């Protein structure tokens, strides 16, 4: 039947079917349990929420995240993400239906062990796949090569791929995205006598950062610029009603992508991770990498990404090669998209992991089969 | 400035280092 | 800047005397980076300091050269050979669109 | 007036006194800098910290490593690493004793340059010399001709000499040592979820190199080995005290000397590049290099490299001509060994650079007096 | 001129002069009002009450404590206590003294702004500075590295420093401390009858928690120990005449430091905080900062705090490492001894934020000269 494109994400699960524009079901993945005193007999009082309901109550829940920097660190939590975003939203049979997944690169081999195992056992499954998501921004963006900084809320990293060919020796992964700017966020907030110190508040530093915040094209004359005068100020309204005013701090948050140095990380920023990714290569096809930088996943999509990457891209390169940032807009859920290209192809028939082969290998055909 | 900056043979050689080794 | 190789030409000379170096004419542009290299007695000082002192000491008007070259620095990043190699391909690529004009059909 | 040998490789400062047996200071060629913020007043907090201070006090510093790929880039950085293998290591002044420096093949001429430079300008001697690595480790080896495969941490290159000539057309160099195996080992243990990504983890992982791996024999029949039964299973204690286990990647980590394939080099093994260095040569002296396969360099101390080294090479040249390997157990200071005893001879006393010569000649009287 | 350390904390004000071994004038941090018609013409009737003398008189006031979780809340309350403390306690001059002030971590900027903006223009000195709390107690201790536990009466912070070199990324902030131990205190006796809910009640509230009070080295067998024999309770005489009981109370009040879901608080308890803060730290230096637990501040002389410490750390780090609870005796005003350690220093001279610069610069240069 028709396919099943469900990216389990670090933040944000986007579930759909196969060869559509859009996904069907986007909902942060949080299993939310309560901590204080149920005093009220009967009133369909459920012991977890997860998903939307556990972000609509989250006053009285302990929210965790079941993945952790791409790793699945609690697999009952991830057992009920895949509950939820099966019977819940979608509202389907999976034992008929196959199910594409995505991962990032450089991961321990035994989550894909157990993703296969619960994939293969709980949620039984005629066929599924793991496959990589720089491959399928890259499927979502038309071209066949080119070098993907994929960022999704654990996981920044880099890969290029040449004619199809996914490059293994110079892929880089640096872990640092949006749940660490987000904690930083909560660090700088009390600058100014603002307290986040609870899960409840993350969600509301989140949404601060994704309504307010930008990456400056030059930091220190906005620093200057922010110093100089309040002409930077924006303000916000707390779901209490109290207003909150932020000034340098809608791009210091930011700044951490290209200054890993502030949050204590010895390593560079994404700029230096892509050049030190694209020199890894051979010589013969970083003119075809220079100018091919797709951008994907939602840490990307601050408006002044591009122009800071491209400048910094620019001032790391010899200045007679062209650089060009493929940025799209629907870049967010690109991840996806691509792999409603990839489920929708007449010859990735062939290459599905059936339950056969699991029967007669156990769970590690799939580091055989895919890549 | 005078202030600042004021400032066989081949077979001996072989077994010359054949007796350094040993 | 050419008051700049006037002294470092006169003070070298006076280092360079009684050497292979003495009496010399004229040196190189490229050398102008090594002047770094050239340290004192006590280590404390290089002959780029030497005269970066003596500059503020004695001649002040020299000071300005690097206001006067500004695009110096756009200048040394951009490739001659490239630049005639994208040339010669730009020819290459108008003569042969030319030619696709004149074979084009009706 | 005794002279020193000073090895200021990739790897490891090697120096002392000539004449001797074992080197009196063996150091690593690390400078340390500061990246927090100070906070205590007083007590003497130094800017760099070189040496093995550096080493002890490695949580907080940013390491650097003056000599990268055989090449001298840094040069203050070098300038600090003699001054202090001069004044606190050896303790003695510079400008009494003559000094012998080794240098890697094929270099770029500045830096031999820059080395009589700053050796007749800030460590002025009276005399010193310049030598070729490989030529002091055949002259370590007990006797004249030979081909000595010299592995530091940056450059693995093949040079032989035929009694006592250096044939400079069969000098083959490959870029794959000890670093990149140490980058290879951090690259592929993240594959157990046990991340290291500082600069004060590659000398954790450097360590973990050291004491664990080996080169095995067969790599197919040691994977089998591995992919059967857990016996080859090692543990390790970090300072923090974490045990990690590893299994089959005590002997993947040596196996890109043997397969470039791993970290995407399109050269070929040692072996094969050994075995293109000696058909480079003549027809006519070529039995006496198969016989005399002198190794040297810390990269070559791992303890499967002989067995491995002998089968490959056996299965490359005909069998009529004898394959031996000399593997001495001082091959660490075997650059140390030839330098001590080349320094002490009778006949290099008119060998000499001397101050008046580069007073007449310049810094350049390197390149014609020495091979 | 000998300097003043003043260390202005949440509950208790510490001040003296530079380089005594005690603390000159320690007293409480309270404004009185009177709440009472006055009908006495005469007789030196005040409007305000500071300190002791609220303190003695405190039957017929209101106590304001101008300074909650760190944050000065009431300014003119402040000025009045830096009054009492330069003119009635300590007797001096401020105009020919400078001042040394502490600061919590993570204070919000316009505290430390108006701190300045006060002590140069209403008690005008020649220098001032301001400094951090655990700083101070790692001066006390008289070592170099460790992390330090700094519990007064509104903040408790964990800060770790390596060789002077302290981590700004992992320092940790929760704010409770001892007001809220003696609110939950007041919360936990209306179970045995005793009611108190005026200002003057929690002073005496307080003096039964530093009299009586202990930490349980284990909870669930002191909490068996105490419902099945009354061998842990004990009583207590108030100014009335009433003499109350109390039993399992004594150990369940400071059990909100080590499980703060009590009283609401989604955060863990302080073990953990140390803990999470040692482990977000570099890896070479967790050992050192394992044998230097220093502990400080008037909340951390409970005397059972420092094996139940001990016991949790143990229990959660790995066990071939030493876990050392560094208590000194003197622990209560360790931080003005480190203030007496800093401002009679030689260095420090050089450190200090004149009149000039400030006129120079405004109110802002602290943030910039200061930590
Ligand atoms: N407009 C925006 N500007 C900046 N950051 C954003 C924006 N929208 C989302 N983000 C960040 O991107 C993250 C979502 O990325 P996503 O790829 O959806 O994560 P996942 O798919 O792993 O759940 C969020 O954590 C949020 O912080
Ligand atoms: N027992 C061993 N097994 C494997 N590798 C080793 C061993 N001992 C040392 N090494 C490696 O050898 C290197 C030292 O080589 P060295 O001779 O110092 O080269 P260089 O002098 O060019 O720096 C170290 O970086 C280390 O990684
Ligand atoms: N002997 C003691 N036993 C238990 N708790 C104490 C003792 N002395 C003081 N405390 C608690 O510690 C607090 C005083 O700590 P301190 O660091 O002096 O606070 P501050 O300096 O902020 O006024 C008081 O609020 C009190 O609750
Ligand atoms: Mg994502
Ligand atoms: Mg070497
Ligand atoms: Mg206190």
Redesign the interface.
């Given at each position: 039947t028709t396919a099943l494109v469900c990216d389990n994400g670090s933040g944000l699960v986007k579930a759909g079917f196969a060869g559509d524009d859009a996904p069907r079901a986007v909902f942060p993945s949080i299993v939310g349990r309560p901590?204080?005193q149920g005093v009220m007999v009967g009133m369909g009082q459920k012991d977890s929420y997860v998903g939307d309901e556990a972000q609509s109550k989250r006053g009285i829940l302990?929210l965790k995240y079941p993945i952790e920097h791409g790793?699945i660190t609690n697999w009952d939590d991830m057992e009920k993400i895949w509950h939820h975003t099966f019977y819940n939203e979608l509202r389907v049979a999976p034992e008929e239906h196959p199910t594409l997944l995505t991962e990032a690169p450089?991961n321990?081999?035994?989550n894909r062990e157990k993703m296969t195992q619960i994939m293969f056992e709980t949620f039984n499954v005629p066929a599924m796949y793991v496959a990589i998501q720089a491959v399928l921004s890259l499927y979502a963006s038309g071209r066949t090569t080119g070098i993907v900084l994929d960022s999704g809320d654990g996981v920044t990293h880099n890969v290029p791929i040449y004619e199809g060919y996914a490059?293994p020796?110079?892929i880089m992964?640096?872990?640092l995205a949006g749940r660490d700017l987000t904690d930083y966020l909560m660090?700088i907030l009390?600058?100014?006598?603002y307290?986040f110190?609870?899960?409840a508040e993350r969600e509301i530093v989140r949404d601060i950062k994704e309504k307010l915040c930008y990456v400056a094209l030059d930091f220190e004359n906005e620093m200057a610029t922010a110093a100089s005068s309040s002409s930077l100020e924006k303000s916000y309204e707390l779901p209490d009603g109290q207003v909150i005013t932020i000034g340098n701090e809608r791009f210091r948050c930011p700044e951490t992508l290209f200054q890993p140095?502030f949050?204590?990380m010895?390593?560079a920023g994404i700029h230096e991770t892509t050049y030190n990714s694209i020199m890894?290569c051979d010589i013969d096809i970083r003119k075809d990498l220079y100018a091919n930088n797709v951008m994907s996943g939602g840490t990307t999509m601050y408006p002044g990404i591009a122009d800071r990457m491209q400048k910094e891209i620019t001032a790391l390169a010899?200045?007679?090669m062209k650089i060009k940032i493929i940025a799209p807009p629907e870049r967010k859920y690109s991840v996806w998209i691509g792999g409603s290209i990839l489920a929708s192809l007449s010859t990735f028939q062939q290459m599905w992991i059936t339950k056969q082969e699991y029967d007669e290998a156990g769970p590690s055909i799939v580091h055989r089969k895919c890549f | 400035l005078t202030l600042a900056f004021s400032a066989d043979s081949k077979t001996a050689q072989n077994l010359s280092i054949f007796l350094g080794s040993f | 800047f050419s008051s700049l190789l006037e002294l470092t030409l006169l003070v070298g000379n006076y280092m360079n005397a009684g050497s292979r170096n003495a009496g010399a004419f004229g040196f190189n542009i490229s050398f102008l980076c090594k002047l770094r290299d050239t340290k004192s007695a006590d280590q404390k000082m290089t002959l780029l300091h030497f005269l970066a002192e003596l500059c503020e000491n004695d001649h002040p008007e020299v000071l300005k050269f690097p206001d006067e070259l500004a695009h110096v620095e756009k200048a040394s990043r951009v490739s001659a050979e490239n630049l005639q190699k994208s040339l010669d391909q730009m020819k290459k690529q108008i003569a042969d669109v030319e030619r696709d004009v004149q074979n084009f059909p009706a």
């Open positions: 901590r204080h302990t790793i450089l321990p081999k035994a490059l020796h110079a992964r640096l872990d660090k009390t600058e100014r006598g307290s110190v609870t899960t140095s949050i204590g010895e390593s890894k010899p200045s007679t | - | -």
